């Protein structure tokens with residue numbers, strides 16, 4: 001492996017914030033390699049009681065190798081902080097891309113879905129379920145390719161509430177939020193949420209209250225603006241099924257006619 005430490009890196013502009021520490025642009029001093037350094041404060045992690053998510057992220061994300069999964073290269077720590085050494089995603093997040101464009105055309109959407117579906121096929125083949133697929137955790141590489149990041153919630157499938165609790169529920173399926181056993185099908189529901197948000201500019205169960213979002217998800221109550229096409233409606237409506245077993249496999253998504261006609265391969 002190789003024991004890094006702080007002074008191995010020049011730190012740059014803050015790329016952004018998370019709950020437990022910012023991510024920073026960094027350059028390794030000897031190679032000039034540009035990467036991102038995710039800082040987590042130990043104090044805050046222990047208090048929140050999620051250090052196992054950290055171990056999981058590191059163990060899981062460092063062994064995955066897929067062009068649409070963000071690489072984790074390693075980690076180090078000092079007294080107050082843990083530092084994850086990540087692949088740098090130069091075009092930013094899909095969240096920012098959505099706030100910039102408001103919503104995506106069917107080509108950009110279908111293409112992102114395809115990249116997501118491929119990355120997820122790779123993950124589910126190892127029974128790794130991400131569980132936190134949302135636009136803030138989807139990054140863009142230099143060619144604009146999508147990269148799944150932030151594997152802190154990920155786990156090997158079958159799993160049950162596996163951590164503490166919650167925050168934004170928008171992207172989570174009814175099994176998850178209700179704390180029932182769940183498996184790969186979780187990420188299929190999320191894909192459905194994403195496809196709607198990309199096309200519509202807001203997630204389909206958006207509400208002004210957690211408790212109201214919960215209700216909407218649990219009853220699967222959503223509607224489509226008129227501009228959304230029948231092919232997109234058909235994909236989304238197949239993904240957003242309350243019963244996981246009724247959700248398609250990823251292969252079926254990849255070969256969906258709407259995806260086939262719109263995706264840039």
Ligand SMILES: O=c1[nH]c2ncccc2c2ccccc12
Nearest residue numbers: 015016023036087088089091092
């Ligand atoms: O442009 C970004 N690139 C990144 N690359 C790696 C990790 C986080 C990021 C990142 C994180 C938040 C906001 C923007 C960015």
